[PDB]
Design a protein around this ligand. Structure first.
Ligand SMILES: [Zn+2]
Lengths: 56, 44, 112, 123
RNA sequence: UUAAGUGAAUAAGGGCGCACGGUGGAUGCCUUGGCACUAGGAGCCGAUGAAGGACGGGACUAACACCGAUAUGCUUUGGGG
RNA sequence: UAGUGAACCAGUACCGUGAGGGAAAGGUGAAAAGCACCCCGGAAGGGGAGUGAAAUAGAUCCUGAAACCGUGUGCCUACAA
RNA sequence: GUAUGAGUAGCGAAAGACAGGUGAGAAUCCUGUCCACCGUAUGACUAAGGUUUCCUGGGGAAGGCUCGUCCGCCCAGGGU
């Protein structure tokens, strides 16, 4: 089928109350205090578990 | 399938040429009718 | 005196709705939190408002202020820019237009 | 299980990935491939422990037939062929370890597709 | 303390007013270009190769204009500083 | 959007094998004096500092309406056809 | 000129994975290995037709149904 009418200006902003973005799980490190994701390797630190993993 | 505008070089100048539009009294009408507008390409 | 340096970026090739999502996550927060938030969102409009905040912070440092650690993002806008226009061949001969949109992104950084 | 592709393409994939970690001992891939490679690498090193074959003649399926891993000379250029490394190095490293030979870490989403990524090591 | 009765305020989002921006080119003003005529001129060009063109000519040359292997020009007679 | 179809390199771009059909597009300031130099950024873009009577006249450049899209807020809204 | 439909349908038949490069930035570019597809053809040579798409060195504003350091794209030189 085919839409019957123009949807007004109100029903846009009544649909779109569930078109949000959310951040989840930001914690402070143990070694630099920089907010980095829990259960994840800290990117600038390189310091998961207090152990440097990215090693060559 | 085959469509129409399948080009050649002998046919598009032994049909729409110049030496077939200075060979009638209707090719001359065509050339003189195109020069009134001032078209650049007169024929092929 | 003054506070609240500005920074903009005109005609950025992103759709303006999909960049109004990210700016909802920054309004009213300190600068220390906001960069950390923007590094961990995998969207295209993350890696742009990062550069706008960094340029606004650098304006506030190297023109007027001190106290980088007492700045608050107080206003953020998304405005629509000039759209490009192209076409695309749909089936059975016809065609249908395609917008290509652009946005203008600004960030104002007061102290508190 | 975890379906990824058609039937024979999973066998191709899990033979392709798990002959790395035998040559390089570190891999950067996604989540799901990593958990299947957990299972298959830990099933192949325990054939690495026996030394019969039956250890040879079952490892001739989930290992690529010859992929050389050469950093060695005595006076030659002698070759470790990605199965001989199982029956020479990785075998006797785990004579006192039970199961559980792998670690999985959680790094970043990929730029293009936002697929979350993973490092696999051994120890 | 029990019991019976009366019950405000907060908004995930939305409406109205106001204030400030962005997109878009209406309206205001203006003129290289047109329209309709008046008075005078002129009313043909060509085998001594016409109209219309193609290719070329500059220090740099894509296009317009101008010119033709003497090619962004040659000779002469007047004007002009 | 008028006036020639054509104020702008228009019988052009483009469409059809062909005869043929045929558009849109004017305006910075008096003077280019068209932003040296510094900072963010790969660049685009921006903030100072200058030119200028004016830069909210910065080249898509006089004025800049309406639909349309945003920000902030004085009042109201979760037993209602 | 701008909406609604809506951030919806679609993204045009096919097998990739890892390591190392370059770079502000990489699943999409380069290199290496293994795997896989056609093999009376998805292999070679020419006639039409197209008209510089060919080669070398740069570039990433628009085109590429995503990304793009790449290209039959843009700039400069050069080849029959
Ligand atoms: Zn840390």
């Amino acid at each position: 089928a085919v839409p019957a009418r123009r949807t007004s200006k109100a029903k846009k902003a009544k649909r779109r109350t569930h078109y949000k973005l959310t951040i989840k799980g930001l914690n402070a490190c143990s070694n630099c205090g920089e907010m980095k994701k829990s259960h994840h390797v800290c990117p600038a630190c390189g310091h998961y578990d207090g152990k440097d993993v990215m090693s060559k | 399938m085959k469509r129409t505008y399948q080009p050649n070089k002998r046919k598009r100048q032994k049909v729409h040429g110049f030496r077939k539009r200075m060979s009638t009294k209707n090719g001359r009408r065509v050339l003189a009718s195109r020069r009134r507008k001032g078209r650049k390409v007169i024929s092929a | 005196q003054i506070t609240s340096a500005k920074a903009t970026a005109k005609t950025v090739r992103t759709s303006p709705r999909k960049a109004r999502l990210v700016i909802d996550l920054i309004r009213g927060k300190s600068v220390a939190d906001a960069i950390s938030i923007l590094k961990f969102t995998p969207n295209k409009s993350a890696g742009i408002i990062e550069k706008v905040l960094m340029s606004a912070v650098a304006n506030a440092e190297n023109n007027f202020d001190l106290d980088v650690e007492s700045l608050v993002v107080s206003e953020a806008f998304v405005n629509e820019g000039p759209t490009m226009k192209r076409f695309r061949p749909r089936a059975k001969g016809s065609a249908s237009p395609i917008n290509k949109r652009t946005s203008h992104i600004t960030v104002v950084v007061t102290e508190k | 299980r975890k379906l990824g592709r058609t039937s024979s393409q999973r066998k191709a994939m899990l033979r392709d990935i798990t002959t790395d970690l035998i040559i390089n001992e570190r891999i950067v891939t996604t989540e799901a491939r990593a958990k299947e490679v957990r299972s298959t690498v830990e099933k192949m090193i325990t054939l690495g422990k026996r030394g019969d074959l039956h250890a040879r003649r079952q490892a001739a399926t989930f290992v690529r037939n010859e992929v050389a891993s050469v950093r060695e000379e005595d006076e030659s250029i002698v070759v470790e062929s990605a199965l001989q490394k199982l029956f020479n190095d990785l075998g006797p490293r785990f004579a006192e370890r039970q199961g559980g030979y792998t670690r999985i870490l959680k790094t970043e989403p990929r730029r293009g597709d936002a697929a979350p990524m993973v490092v696999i090591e051994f120890v």
